[PDB]
From a paper:
The pro-oncogenic cellular activities of estrogen receptor alpha (ERα) drive breast cancer pathogenesis. Ligand-dependent transcriptional activities depend on the association of coactivator proteins with ERα to form functional complexes. SERMs and SERDs elicit a structural rearrangement of the ERα LBD to sterically preclude binding of coactivators in the activating function-2 cleft. Activating somatic mutations near ERα helix 12, Y537S and D538G, enable hormone therapy resistance in metastatic ER +breast cancers.
We solved x-ray crystal structures of antiestrogens in complex with Y537S and WT ERα ligand binding domain (LBD) to understand the structural basis of differential transcriptional antagonistic efficacies. LA-5 possesses a 2 S methylpyrrolidine and showed a SERM-like profile with an IC50 of 15.68+0.27 nM and a normalized fluorescence of 1.706 ± 0.09 at 5 μM. LA3-2 and LA5-2 are subsequently referred to as LA-Deg and LA-Stab for Laso degrader and stabilizer respectively. We discovered that addition of a 3R-methyl group on Laso’s pyrrolidine induced both ERα SUMOylation and degrading activities, while addition of a 2S-methyl on the pyrrolidine leads to an accumulation of ERα in the breast cancer cells. LA-Deg induces SUMOylation but to a lesser maximum than fulvestrant and GDC0927 in WT and is further reduced in Y537S, while LA-Stab did not induce SUMOylation with either receptor. Laso, LA-Stab, and LA-Deg showed intermediate efficacy. In these Y537S structures, H12 is slightly more dynamic and the S537-E380 hydrogen bond is no longer observed. Overall, these structures present canonical ERα LBD homodimers with 2–4 monomers in the asymmetric unit.
Numbering used by the authors:
A (entry chain B): 307 to 336, 341 to 416, 421 to 529, 535 to 550
B (entry chain A): 306 to 338, 341 to 417, 420 to 461, 464 to 528, 535 to 545
């Protein structure tokens, strides 16, 4: 796991990818928040499956897996959405049957921020292999500064998370080296990619403000993560 | 000529631009309590020096005043926060708001303690990484340039965004150069670059939480007056 090569890391992440789900409406019939909520809830189940396949994640305690997904889940939905939307300028591909433009989004604020991210991804010509690295970084990084714990186990947990994050950095650099970029270009693109994650955090916080405005997730996460081996 | 700077010239430029460390203004001969009031007054005085600082970050005054305002509107609380975390770095468990205002997390209990704890953790993480002064000024400049650059489509705006990203690239070059100079291997350089940049997502998170607090009880006009 920390023993994986760059190519094995990339292969593992690509293999872990969740499916693209559909909105649940009658397409024969003639609302929006309900559709998005239902989609997101279904997507969360698959997200837990994906998370367990990110190298290193199931090495963590269940408490820490819950903490990381509780921190990162909306970021992860958002980056998935932005990736799906990357070749549909001005629109957001929530699902193959739910492609919305900004007028249909009317918070249109969240909507515009997501569109700009998709644009930035298009500008950078983000690759699939880069995307899955970034999404795994979100999963490992977003909650790693907010463990409210300094037990010896917590120190070990945090060290492991940072070692896995380091392996993903190595993997990104390797992908860029393989694509012919100079060392200078390599560190510049690495930086460009990681700085977008700040914007994605911003978007998640804005979205969370919207959802909390609608009146514990940790219990659901724990239920889905704390699986038995009876299958 | 900002894009023509060497890494060493970029670093000297940034170190030279650093704002002063301000004091809280209260009567120290008087009994202690007024916390938000003290922190607000401090933050407001610190904002004026921030504008001065930003105009000295290579490349920033090449931008339109509209875009300078937009970048500082996005980033100002992040910038106050990374400043605080930096001067708190050698004070485990406390936050050095000012040399005469050093607070532990219990004193922050007077929705604040949540923000206090996140800031303390960032100071811890800086301690663990042994963040250097030259790295810190690079990171703070990156916040200034990056935080608002996804939320500005005119020809001018395309040109502005390209310039911002080119300056950000030069600061990335500069970080890597600092790390190479400190004797780190190429692998260690890229790993440390990534570790430093990923802390910026947490600082963004902290800013949004803090903004929720401040709005709970327009700035661009004040920024414009100060920048113009
Ligand atoms: C999944 C969450 C966790 C438990 C309860 N459930 C509440 C609903 O959460 C959401 C999350 C995202 C959305 C929208 C969405 C849907 C699917 C997806 O792949 C991407 C996104 C991105 C954000 C979007 C949204 C978020 C907040 C406010 C409006 C829209 C809507 C509701
Ligand atoms: C400066 C701004 C812009 C216009 C009005 N003015 C109000 C913002 O006020 C604050 C008040 C407190 C802070 C606290 C602080 C003070 C000084 C400084 O160097 C660092 C910080 C870190 C954040 C901190 C804060 C922010 C929100 C809630 C509680 C504490 C930051 C900004």
């Amino acid at each position: 796991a920390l023993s994986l090569t760059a190519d094995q890391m990339v292969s593992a992440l690509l293999d872990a990818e969740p499916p693209i789900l559909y909105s649940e409406y009658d397409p024969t019939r003639p609302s929006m928040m309900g559709l998005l909520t239902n989609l997101a809830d279904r997507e969360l189940v698959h997200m837990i499956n994906w998370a367990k396949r990110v190298p290193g994640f199931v090495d963590l305690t269940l408490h820490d897996q819950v903490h990381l997904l509780e921190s990162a889940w909306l970021e992860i939905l958002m980056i998935g959405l932005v990736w799906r939307s990357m070749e549909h300028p001005g629109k957001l591909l929530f699902a193959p049957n739910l492609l919305l433009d900004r007028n249909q989004g009317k918070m249109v604020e969240i909507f515009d921020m997501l569109l700009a991210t998709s644009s930035r991804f298009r500008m950078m010509n983000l690759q699939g292999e880069e995307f899955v690295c970034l999404k795994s970084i979100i999963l490992l990084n977003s909650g790693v500064y907010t463990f409210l714990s300094s037990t010896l186990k917590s120190l070990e947990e945090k060290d492991h998370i940072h070692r896995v994050l380091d392996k993903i950095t190595d993997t990104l650099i390797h992908l860029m080296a393989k694509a012919g970029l100079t060392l200078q270009q390599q560190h510049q693109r690495l930086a460009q990619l990681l700085l977008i994650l700040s914007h994605i955090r911003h978007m998640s916080n804005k979205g969370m403000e919207h959802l909390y405005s609608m009146k514990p997730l940790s219990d659901l996460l724990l239920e889905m993560l704390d699986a038995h081996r009876l299958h």
